[PDB]
């Protein structure tokens, strides 16, 4: 009864553990991925606001 209930919950906890541990590698890979995205977009944003890039960009069409 209360014992059965506890045992069942412990089994569900094993399941909860399994699922989250399974998801771990994907979360690690994705942190790498989101890091790359965030970093390169920012680099792009900084570049776009760099006067030299603004000058270079406006000049290109004449090449």
């Amino acid at each position: 009864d209360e014992r059965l209930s506890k045992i069942i919950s412990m089994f569900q906890a094993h399941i909860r553990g399994y699922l989250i541990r399974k998801a771990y590698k994907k979360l690690q890979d994705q942190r790498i991925g989101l890091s790359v995205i965030q970093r390169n977009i920012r680099k792009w944003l900084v570049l776009r606001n760099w006067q030299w890039w603004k000058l270079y960009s406006k000049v290109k069409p004449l090449l």
């Binding site: 059965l4 209930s5 045992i7 919950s9 569900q12 906890a13 909860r16 699922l19 771990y24």
Partner: protein, 156 residues
């Protein structure tokens, strides 16, 4: 307690990943305290996690690393089910005594009893354990218990 100080760095690595996932700021949402611990190899029940500070939903409390220390320590002492208990549990649902439980009965115990799981969680564990029903719609619960206990990479 006597954490290997390796289990401390382990916790540091897990903490950093979760911190990153809800905004890298040196704090992890308390709703994720249980999942952090689960990543370290333990299987706390909901009730165990709440008792050490885990919250019921995202956006209530955020915790720093040092808060995770006593919590993780406390959870290690949490009772973990044994194969004997699991077989004794499922046996009660085996009227025939042949080691079978219907896929439906299994989904029922998992989503309606104890600290209930979602139908989506059940879907995922059934899929990950590659659990198959026989022609009659039944499953061998011993196999399922073993698969669940062994882990996602299969010796855990």
């Amino acid at each position: 307690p006597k954490l290997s100080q390796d289990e401390i760095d382990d916790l540091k690595d897990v903490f950093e990943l979760f911190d990153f996932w809800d905004g890298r700021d040196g704090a992890v949402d308390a709703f994720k305290l249980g999942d952090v611990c689960r990543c370290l190899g333990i299987n706390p029940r909901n009730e165990d996690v709440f008792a050490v500070g885990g919250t019921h939903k995202m956006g209530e409390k955020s915790l720093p690393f040092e808060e995770f220390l006593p919590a993780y320590e406390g959870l290690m002492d949490c009772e973990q089910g044994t194969f004997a208990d699991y077989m004794e549990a499922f046996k009660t649902f085996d009227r025939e005594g042949q080691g079978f439980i219907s896929g439906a009965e299994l989904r029922h115990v998992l989503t309606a009893l104890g600290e209930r799981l979602s139908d989506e969680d059940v879907d995922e564990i059934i899929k990950l354990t590659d659990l198959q029903e026989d022609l009659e719609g039944n499953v061998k619960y011993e196999d399922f218990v073993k698969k669940v206990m062994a882990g996602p990479y299969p010796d855990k």
